[PDB]
């Protein structure tokens, strides 16, 4: 839900605002991390994409006229 | 960042996947709450939009070939 993950070619693209992102390879190795978004060039194989959302609270002021 | 908030006419539209949304009026009253998104019809005045993201961790399996 609060992220997108997609693969095209060898490219894994991950988008998740205010989230810590991690990609693990099959050996459980952290091959990349980034906040918010990532474009990872992978090799053939299976990967685990981890999205850790930060769980903050935000407030916005809105004026209705 | 992990949400959008916009007022158009008397309509307040809020979008934030996996989040608890709240709108408070000027008296501090909860006038609406929803998961993930809402379309609120307001009266003239000032509103506080609160976005409480859930802070969960997600994992997706990705295959590169
Ligand atoms: Ca409350
Ligand atoms: Zn490691
Ligand atoms: Zn090593
Ligand atoms: Zn770790
Ligand atoms: Zn921080």
Residue numbers in the entry:
A (entry chain B), B (entry chain A): 672 to 736
Paper text:
Translocation of gingipains from the periplasm across the OM is dependent on a conserved C-terminal domain (CTD), which appears to be important for secretion of the proteins and in particular, truncation of the last few C-terminal residues of this domain leads to accumulation of gingipains in the periplasm.
In addition to the rIgSF-CTD tandem of the Ig-like folded domains, we solved the structure of the rCTD alone. Crystals were obtained from a fragment encompassing residues S664–K736, which crystallized in the hexagonal space group, P65. The structure was solved to 1.9 Å resolution and the Fourier map enabled us to trace residues K672–K736. The asymmetric unit contained a dimer of rCTD molecules (approximately 75 Å × 21 Å × 14 Å) in a side-to-side arrangement, with the monomers related to each other by a twofold axis. In this structure, strand 7 was swapped between the two monomers and constituted the primary interface between them. Thus, in this conformation, the s6-s7 loop, instead of a turn, adopts an extended conformation along the s6 main axis, bringing s7 to interact with the neighboring monomer. The equivalent region from the neighboring monomer then occupies the space generated by this movement in an identical manner. This domain swap, as a consequence, generates an antiparallel β-sheet between strands s6 and s7, as occurs in the absence of swapping, that has the same backbone and side chain set of interactions, with the only differences being the monomer that provides s7 and the conformation of the s6-s7 loop.
